[PDB]
Ligand binder design. Structure first.
Ligand code: CL
Ligand code: CL
Ligand code: CL
Ligand code: CL
Ligand code: CL
Ligand code: CL
Lengths: 347, 346
């Protein structure tokens, strides 16, 4: 396989992508450029919103989905004009997750000219950064059944075989009005003090070797208006991160048995992910010296019910950061590693 | 003394004052009128801002001085005086024009008699908002005050104790970071034990007149987005002392228990007290008056010397729609004030 030519082409397509603003929900022009780029490779695409896909020829055999996102986080030097400096390509969305988008497509295109035991689907999803309803969630029900998926996010090409989920809970304590200088009222602030300590100290029974215990964090609180008015109402927000041993639904039910104050989940759908260690892909990865781990960062894996693994070029620490960059050498390395894992893989 | 004549003159001045709008900080015209009135009575006045005072004749520093005080400002309407059912309506009639007019008549009469003490009459402004241009601006400039009488609606019963006010802002400081990672320092978790402490602690000294120091945590705020560990959390504490502590005494104890940066908006609105064995108090009790403790702030809070709060009307009427004062209340006040002060061996 011609790695240097795939790398040189992946890098030019990424410069184009960095130059096109593609913040969550305002990704139309980037999606245009992507679709029109693939079309020029003799491939017939599919589209829904700013989500673009491409099925392999002669399908339906197990199917492997190759996926990453084209939306970016808002900025914050340089704007989004690409710049190269002694091996580094600077740009918003270069590390998270552009580098993965350009590598997987080059790999998809090369593998479409080889004889494999599986069908292959490429997907450039949108609204990943805000967990948006018109992202990946809107496309899965139309595509053919997915047997296995690779999600491209920066993991220094290490296989993330477990990923924490996300659930946000709004809790409200209702007290009673009064004069603070008198013997009147029910203080809504006092009512939530034990609740907050419980959120910080409670440990769910099942603990994961890869993600440790379920994590819960009280990160926003509000109550009261002026100093001589009894606070009637108090609201707080809990950010909850399941391990792969629990659903968001299992956690909410447990929590409602210990907390008396009204509590509501904003959603239950962004669950944790898991893939069995004997899975053929995990097994070939390990035989190639890769070290499987568990990721604390949410991705498009959370909207996938089928088995998946998170593995892509770049590093976590550069994401959502000033002067974000990807190394030309990391893209070269990613393409070659992706090719070795997939070529001759039997599910 | 001619009590009926004094009463008609006091009631006549009260009408003229009600008609002049004097919302806190905007009492210039009401103070102009009042200054002129006092000058026309043949008394030389003193003035600073909208505070008007005058001193008894032959004032000497070898005798003790009693200060008579009330305020000319009023709260915003909830001003044309009407009379109906032996009762005078208008903004500032109960709180506190009725004391203003009564104390002035009492002052002008005692100034023509021989007493063991000197007198100062003071009409202060900005009381309702405890403003800096009010009584706080005047006191350091006057001669020494042995004790003062503050005229507020107490039904001519003496308030010998008054609560103070202190507001505290406490801030916990942490460190930001990602909530799903092993990062940051949560500023909200830092304040949990503190808030329980403010609600459960009881100061050692309780008053029979005001009960114990009261503290309440009434406002809390922290955080912005769910995935970011909060690095700041601020809350507010409303604290009302009894007469057995200054606000600084309360702050020093609080700081021994709370590590988080805590800052008072001010210490200056302290509790007040006058000893039960003070001669004025003993005279009142002898006349069948019943001393009590008031939970309501007044200009007493800015006086470091001993004081008693006693005036015509009832506090239930203050700050209310259709404010009034019974004419019989001005008449009674004048006579009670004169039985108390006339011949008092200070
Ligand atoms: Cl997501
Ligand atoms: Cl109040
Ligand atoms: Cl952060
Ligand atoms: Cl998040
Ligand atoms: Cl201060
Ligand atoms: Cl005393």
């Amino acid at each position: 396989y011609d790695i240097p030519t795939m790398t040189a082409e992946a890098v030019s397509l990424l410069k184009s992508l960095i130059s096109i603003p593609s913040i969550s929900r305002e990704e139309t022009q980037a999606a245009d450029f992507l679709q029109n780029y693939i079309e020029a490779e003799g491939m017939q695409t599919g589209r829904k919103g700013n989500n673009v896909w491409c099925l392999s020829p002669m399908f339906d055999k197990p199917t492997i989905l190759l996926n990453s996102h084209i939306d970016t986080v808002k900025p914050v030097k340089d704007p989004f004009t690409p710049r190269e400096e002694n091996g580094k390509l600077y740009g918003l969305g270069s590390n998270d997750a552009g580098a993965s988008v350009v590598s997987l497509l080059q790999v998809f295109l090369q593998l479409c000219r080889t004889s494999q035991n599986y069908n292959l689907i490429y997907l450039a999803s949108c609204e990943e950064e805000v967990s948006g309803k018109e992202g990946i969630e809107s496309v899965l029900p139309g595509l053919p059944p997915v047997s296995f998926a690779i999600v491209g996010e920066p993991t220094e090409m290490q296989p993330a075989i477990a990923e924490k989920g996300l659930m946000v809970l709004d809790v409200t304590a209702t007290g009673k009005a009064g004069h603070a200088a008198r013997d009147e009222g029910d203080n809504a602030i006092y009512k939530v003090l034990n609740d907050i300590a419980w959120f910080r100290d409670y440990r769910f029974e099942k603990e994961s070797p890869l993600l440790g215990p379920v994590k819960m964090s009280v990160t926003v609180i509000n109550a009261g208006t002026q100093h001589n008015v009894v606070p009637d109402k108090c609201t707080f927000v809990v950010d909850i991160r399941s391990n792969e041993l629990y659903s968001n639904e299992d956690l909410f039910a447990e929590i409602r048995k210990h907390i008396a104050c009204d509590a509501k989940a904003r959603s239950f759908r962004l669950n944790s992910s898991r893939i069995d260690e004997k899975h053929p892909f995990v097994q070939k990865a390990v035989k190639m010296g890769r070290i499987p781990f568990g990721s604390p960062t949410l991705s498009d894996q959370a909207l996938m019910s089928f088995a998946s693994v998170k593995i892509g070029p770049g590093r976590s620490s550069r994401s959502h950061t000033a002067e974000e960059y990807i190394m030309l050498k990391e893209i070269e390395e990613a393409i070659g590693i992706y090719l070795d894992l997939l070529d001759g893989l039997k599910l």
